[PDB]
C-alpha cells in the first residue's frame, strides 16, 4: 500500500524545528529518505528511491559532511536532525583534503559508519576523507563533484591508508 515518511526541507525551518510532518510515498516504488549535506547546510526528508535500500551512505572530510539514508518503515527517516556530531567516532582515522597533497593532508577521526579511507579524483579536483563502503561504490562521489567530470575512486580499510603518496 502506502508508506508514511517524515517530511521536511531546509528551504523552510521544517527540518530544524517544529512538529514532525508526514508524507505518503508509493511503496515499493518509493521509500523514506533523508539526505544531509553540511559544509551549504542542505537537509531534506521525504520520499525517494535509492539503490541499496534499506541502508545508509556517508562521507566526511574536515569541512564537508554528506549522509544519506533510505528505509521502509513508518517515519523511519524521522527523529532528531543529524549532523556529523550525531555519529560517535568509530576508531579509524583518515587523511582529509578538499577539491591537496602530502604537504598538508591532515588526519581526521572517522565517525559512524564512515570507516573506509577514501581518495577520489575528478577529471582536476581531489578529495580524501572517511566514507562508508556504499559511498565508495555507489554513484554518490560522482554527484557532489562540480559538474560532469570523470570520477575514479579508491577506498581502503585501515587507519591512514589513504595518505598522499
Ligand atoms: C579543520 O578545518 C579547519 C579549517 O576550517 C582548520 O582550521 C582546522 O585546523 C582543521 N582541523 C582538523 C582536525 O582537521
From Swiss-Prot:
Q: Which UniProt keywords apply?
A: Cell membrane, Disulfide bond, Glycoprotein, GPI-anchor, Lipoprotein, Membrane, Receptor, Repeat, Secreted, Signal
The tissues in which it is expressed are: Expressed in angiogenic endothelial cells (at protein level).
Q: Which residues are glycosylated?
A: 62, 72, 150
Q: Which domain of life is it from?
A: Eukaryota
MF-aspect GO terms: enzyme binding; protein domain specific binding; signaling receptor binding
Would the keyword Disulfide bond turn up in this protein's UniProt record? yes
Q: Where is the UPAR/Ly6 domain?
A: 3-91, 92-165
Q: Which residues cross the membrane?
A: none
- Between which residues do disulfide bridges form? 5-32, 8-15, 25-47, 53-70, 71-76, 94-117, 97-100, 110-130, 136-155, 156-161
| GO terms under biological process | negative regulation of intrinsic apoptotic signaling pathway; positive regulation of epidermal growth factor receptor signaling pathway; positive regulation of homotypic cell-cell adhesion; positive regulation of release of cytochrome c from mitochondria; regulation of cell adhesion; regulation of fibrinolysis; regulation of plasminogen activation; urokinase plasminogen activator signaling pathway
Cellular compartments per GO CC: external side of plasma membrane; extracellular region; plasma membrane; protein complex involved in cell-matrix adhesion; serine-type endopeptidase complex
Query: What does the record note on quaternary structure?
Result: Monomer. Interacts (via the UPAR/Ly6 domains) with SRPX2. Interacts with MRC2. Interacts with SORL1 (via N-terminal ectodomain); this interaction decreases PLAUR internalization. The ternary complex composed of PLAUR-PLAU-SERPINE1 also interacts with SORL1. Interacts with CD82; this interaction prevents PLAUR from binding to its high affinity ligand PLAU.
Write out the function statement from the record.
Acts as a receptor for urokinase plasminogen activator. Plays a role in localizing and promoting plasmin formation. Mediates the proteolysis-independent signal transduction activation effects of U-PA.
> Which named protein is this?
Urokinase plasminogen activator surface receptor
> From which source organism is this entry?
Mus musculus (Mouse)
The beginning of the lineage is: Eukaryota, Metazoa, Chordata, Craniata, Vertebrata
Amino acid at each position: 500500500r502506502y508508506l508514511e515518511c517524515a517530511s521536511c526541507t531546509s528551504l523552510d525551518q521544517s527540518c530544524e524545528r517544529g512538529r514532525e510532518q508526514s508524507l505518503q510515498c508509493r511503496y515499493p516504488t518509493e521509500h523514506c529518505i533523508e539526505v544531509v549535506t553540511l559544509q551549504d547546510e542542505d537537509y531534506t526528508r521525504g520520499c525517494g528511491s535509492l539503490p541499496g535500500c534499506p541502508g545508509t551512505a556517508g562521507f566526511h572530510s574536515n569541512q564537508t559532511f554528506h549522509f544519506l539514508k533510505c528505509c521502509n518503515y513508518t517515519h523511519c527517516n524521522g527523529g532528531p536532525v543529524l549532523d556529523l556530531q550525531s555519529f560517535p567516532p568509530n576508531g579509524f582515522q583518515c587523511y582529509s583534503c578538499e577539491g591537496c597533497s602530502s604537504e598538508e593532508a591532515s588526519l581526521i577521526n572517522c565517525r559512524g559508519p564512515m570507516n573506509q579511507c577514501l581518495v577520489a579524483t575528478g577529471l582536476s579536483y581531489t578529495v580524501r576523507g572517511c566514507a562508508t563502503a556504499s559511498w565508495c561504490q555507489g554513484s554518490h562521489v560522482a554527484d557532489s563533484f562540480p559538474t560532469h567530470l570523470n570520477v575514479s575512486v579508491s577506498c581502503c580499510h585501515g587507519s591512514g591508508c589513504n595518505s598522499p603518496t
